[PDB]
Unconditional design. Sequence first.
Lengths: 83, 83
Amino acid sequence: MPITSKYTDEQVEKILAEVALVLEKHAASPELTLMIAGNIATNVLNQRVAASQRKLIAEKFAQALMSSLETPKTHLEHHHHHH
Amino acid sequence: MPITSKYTDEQVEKILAEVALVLEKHAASPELTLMIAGNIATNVLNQRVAASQRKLIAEKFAQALMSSLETPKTHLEHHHHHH
């Protein structure tokens, strides 16, 4: 789903890994971690994203985040080839 | 806003510097940058946050992001002019 710019998938994973490494590198708490993500998006919306895209991409973000909000509620899925 | 943080800004800022450094390091584009933040929040909402605390903390994050979304809010004028 190309709702976001098609960057290299493995690249995204590698970037996430290094970011998570920095979190571990400073023993970042869940709150601190999630607030750090907030700071990231904030800087995007401040000095990086388009003004016109700003509310749309933020809504897209929130909607995606809501649809990525999961729990151990999965019952009879197709395959556990997912993390 | 002093919510969610409570942590030393010295600590937070230096972590942010290293986190953003990884993004600059890999020449992360705006959408990639913000999608990285999304994956971060998602991971937190999966493994780090509590189930009961999940939706609240997610809303908390979104609302904090909306308020950190700094578009031109209410340009002060003294004419009550129409256009």
